[PDB]
Amino acid sequence: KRSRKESYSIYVYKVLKQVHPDTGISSKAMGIMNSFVNDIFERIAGEASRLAHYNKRSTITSREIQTAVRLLLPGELAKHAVSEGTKAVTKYTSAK
DNA sequence: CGCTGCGAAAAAAAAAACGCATCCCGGTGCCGAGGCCGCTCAATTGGTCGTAGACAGCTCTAGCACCGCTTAAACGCACGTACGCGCTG
């Protein structure tokens, strides 16, 4: 048929339907959301990595992703992202 | 005479007429979203190994107080000049 290009578009849909259940999203914009995710992936991973290296750690922990997010994101956005991030970690650990 | 009243006359200014552009209404029609079909490869399980990082301390650096001598800046005020600021043609 054709090779398989991955995305984030299905995970954007799910989050869109959670947030505005009566709303669609044009291809062109779904692109722009994809780009966005990808951009803010590379940025948090990047700074995460730099943090690890700078401190001689070979392991990127949640602790790095957290500090990455505190450096990249502005005050309010950071707080929440730190909160939604910590929440997710706790609820994953406790599930096993 | 002065006052005044009026009658312009002069703008103001208003109003209103015109005509133009921006909105919105309601029925077309087209295409891409959104939703199914299979299906395939990437995530999960579970479980083995070995080493990154947590800790418990051991060292000696280097960063924080205190302390007067000695200046070179700071504060500051007064006087005056060059510049910033605004109006017009």
CA A31, CA A38: separation in Å to the nearest integer? 11
CA A11 to chain centre: 11
Helix (H, G, I), strand (E, B) or coil at A61: coil
- Rounded Cα distance, A45 and A60, in Å: 9
Type of residue found at A38: N
Protein-contacted positions of strand B (CB under 7 Å): 32-34, 41-42, 52-54
Cα–Cα distance between A76 and A26 in angstroms, integer?
Answer: 29
A27 contact to strand B (CB, 7 A limit): yes
Q: Could you give the residue ranges of the DSSP H alpha helices within chain A?
A: 9-19, 27-55, 62-72, 75-95
Distance, CA of A66 to CA of A72 (rounded, Å):
10
State CA A82 to chain mean position distance: 11
Q: Determine the nucleotide nearest to A58 by Cα–C1' distance.
A: B52
- The contacts of residue A47 (CB under 8 Å, 6+ apart) are A67, A68, A71, A72
**A68 CA to B13 C1', in Å?**
65
In whole angstroms, what separates CA A34 from the centre of its chain? 11
